[PDB]
Amino acid sequence: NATEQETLTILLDVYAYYQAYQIVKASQFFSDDIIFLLELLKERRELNVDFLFQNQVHLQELELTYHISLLDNAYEEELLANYIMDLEAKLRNDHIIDFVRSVSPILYRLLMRLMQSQVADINDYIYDAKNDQYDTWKFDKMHDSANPFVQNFVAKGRDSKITSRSLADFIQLTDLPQAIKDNILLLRDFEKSVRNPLAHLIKPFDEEELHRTTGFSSQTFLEKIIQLAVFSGIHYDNDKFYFDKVNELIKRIYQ
Amino acid sequence: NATEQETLTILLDVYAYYQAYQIVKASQFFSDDIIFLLELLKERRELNVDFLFQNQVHLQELELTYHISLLDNAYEEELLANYIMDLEAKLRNDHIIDFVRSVSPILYRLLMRLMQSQVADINDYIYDAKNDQYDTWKFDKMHDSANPFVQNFVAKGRDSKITSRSLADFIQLTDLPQAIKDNILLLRDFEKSVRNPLAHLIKPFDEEELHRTTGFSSQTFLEKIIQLAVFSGIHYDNDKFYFDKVNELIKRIYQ
Ligand SMILES: [Ca+2]
Ligand SMILES: [Ca+2]
Numbered sequence: 001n002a003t004e005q006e007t008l009t010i011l012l013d014v015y016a017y018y019q020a021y022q023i024v025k026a027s028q029f030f031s032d033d034i035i036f037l038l039e040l041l042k043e044r045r046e047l048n049v050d051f052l053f054q055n056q057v058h059l060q061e062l063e064l065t066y067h068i069s070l071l072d073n074a075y076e077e078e079l080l081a082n083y084i085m086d087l088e089a090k091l092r093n094d095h096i097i098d099f100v101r102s103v104s105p106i107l108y109r110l111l112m113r114l115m116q117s118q119v120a121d122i123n124d125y126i127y128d129a130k131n132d133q134y135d136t137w138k139f140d141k142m143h144d145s146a147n148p149f150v151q152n153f154v155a156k157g158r159d160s161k162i163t164s165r166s167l168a169d170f171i172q173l174t175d176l177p178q179a180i181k182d183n184i185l186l187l188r189d190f191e192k193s194v195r196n197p198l199a200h201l202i203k204p205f206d207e208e209e210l211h212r213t214t215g216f217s218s219q220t221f222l223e224k225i226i227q228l229a230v231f232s233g234i235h236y237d238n239d240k241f242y243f244d245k246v247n248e249l250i251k252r253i254y255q
Numbered sequence: 256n257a258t259e260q261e262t263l264t265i266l267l268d269v270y271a272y273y274q275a276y277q278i279v280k281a282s283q284f285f286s287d288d289i290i291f292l293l294e295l296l297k298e299r300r301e302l303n304v305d306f307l308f309q310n311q312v313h314l315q316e317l318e319l320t321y322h323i324s325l326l327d328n329a330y331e332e333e334l335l336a337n338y339i340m341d342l343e344a345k346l347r348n349d350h351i352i353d354f355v356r357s358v359s360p361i362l363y364r365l366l367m368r369l370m371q372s373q374v375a376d377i378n379d380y381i382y383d384a385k386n387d388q389y390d391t392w393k394f395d396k397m398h399d400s401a402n403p404f405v406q407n408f409v410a411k412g413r414d415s416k417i418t419s420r421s422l423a424d425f426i427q428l429t430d431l432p433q434a435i436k437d438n439i440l441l442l443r444d445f446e447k448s449v450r451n452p453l454a455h456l457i458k459p460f461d462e463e464e465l466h467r468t469t470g471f472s473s474q475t476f477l478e479k480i481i482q483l484a485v486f487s488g489i490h491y492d493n494d495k496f497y498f499d500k501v502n503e504l505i506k507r508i509y510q
């Protein structure tokens with residue numbers, strides 16, 4: 001017996017933008033701006049950044065109207081920023097298992113992005129295999145490299161597959177700040193200790209078990225992922241959650 | 256500013272049992288029965304099935320009191336069933352990406368469980384690899400198997416690593432009904448086309464994109480998984496969602 005507006009509020013607080021969209025879209029008592037804002041947030045949590053740029057004109061209209069930013073990055077950077085928002089949302093809803101499984105794709109992309117900052121032509125040292133198979137290092141081409149970090153990588157006699165693990169090791173040989181390397185070393189241990197087992201195994205898992213296993217809270221891992229992203233040139237607000245900011249905007253409209 | 260009961264109703268509808276639990280603990284207007292039931296549901300979605308058995312005495316009381324089943328399977332079967340109702344919850348909230356990633360371990364466990372029925376000594380042919388690595392087949396060991404299924408498996412030449420795809424192939428050589436085999440072949444393609452890239456890559460993805468890729472909805476894949484579970488001796492209500500049933504009990508108590 002809760003009102004349409006009361007239900008909207010609650011869903012916002014748990015970032016249930018799909019459900020919040022269903023309600024507002026199906027009523028008459030809401031602005032066109034709210035349903036567009038909730039369509040935007042919903043498509044964000046479906047990892048649809050293309051929506052933001054396809055409707056960039058209407059997006060800039062609302063930005064001018066309410067004096068708020070809804071898009072802080074160019075397409076490539078926004079892809080990664082948006083994904084981390086979804087990551088923080090799952091964490092705030094205490095979906096720890098979901099959070100953990102979501103770490104792998106963004107970790108790989110950040111690792112690749114950071115390496116390109118250290119070796120610009122890193123694509124040339126990569127054999128692109130078919131979609132299922134892992135890409136492989138061209139160790140033979142890497143010996144001829146003028147890049148000092150690349151040369152350090154070959155001598156070990158590592159295996160060819162390009163995993164997040166091998167990329168993590170590659171980072172350690174670069175001139176990136178130790179804080180960046182430390183975060184990556186810690187996220188690499190994260191992958192082995194909690195992420196990889198949670199793929200074939202069905203085990204009880206929560207925040208307390210995550211902290212017990214790794215020695216750190218989930219918030220620490222999230223913030224370290226953010227620090228990697230921010231250092232790589234991606235803007236992410238770590239003191240003011242994007243979803244919370246937009247939720248407050250939507251609330252001030254119907255309240 | 257919705258009331259505590261109005262908010263609790265909304266949270267239950269989206270199975271936000273963590274938030275629902277915290278609201279009900281810090282409240283004054285809810286009985287201790289509702290509190291325990293919400294801890295139960297919260298621990299379920301944290302894949303903690305041990306909670307049900309650690310408190311089976313108190314659980315049994317509420318069962319006979321309110322004429323409801325809170326526990327349907329023995330331990331080994333209940334943890335697989337519990338994972339599935341968690342899987343169904345994510346589906347109903349249209350967390351399609353999270354749903355997809357969550358399919359991997361339950362599929363792997365169901366396939367292994369089915370193999371166990373056809374090959375009683377299946378664990379004698381598996382090398383429990385250390386640490387991060389995939390488990391592997393003992394192909395040399397498999398040759399002396401009196402089991403025709405095993406013999407035909409090694410005869411075809413495969414990868415050492417044991418994946419769900421590998422177990423799926425193994426299933427086809429067993430004595431299982433064809434309907435179960437076709438079910439597993441369908442999910443096998445689900446792994447390859449959707450589940451595998453979504454655990455690795457960052458892509459826009461929702462209910463519609465799953466349909467374009469597979470020709471089926473998420474509910475279909477849920478039901479295929481359920482069909483396997485039921486066939487293997489696991490009880491799971493496909494008509495009455497467990498979480499919906501317990502939610503109704505809770506509602507009727509504070510209403
Ligand atoms: Ca009210
Ligand atoms: Ca979409």
Ligand SMILES: [Ca+2]
Nearest residue numbers: 128129130135
């Ligand atoms: Ca590739």
Ligand SMILES: [Ca+2]
Nearest residue numbers: 238239240241
């Ligand atoms: Ca913060």
Ligand SMILES: [Ca+2]
Nearest residue numbers: 206298301303
């Ligand atoms: Ca727990």
Ligand SMILES: [Ca+2]
Nearest residue numbers: 383384385390
């Ligand atoms: Ca193992």
Ligand SMILES: [Ca+2]
Nearest residue numbers: 493494495496
């Ligand atoms: Ca059903």
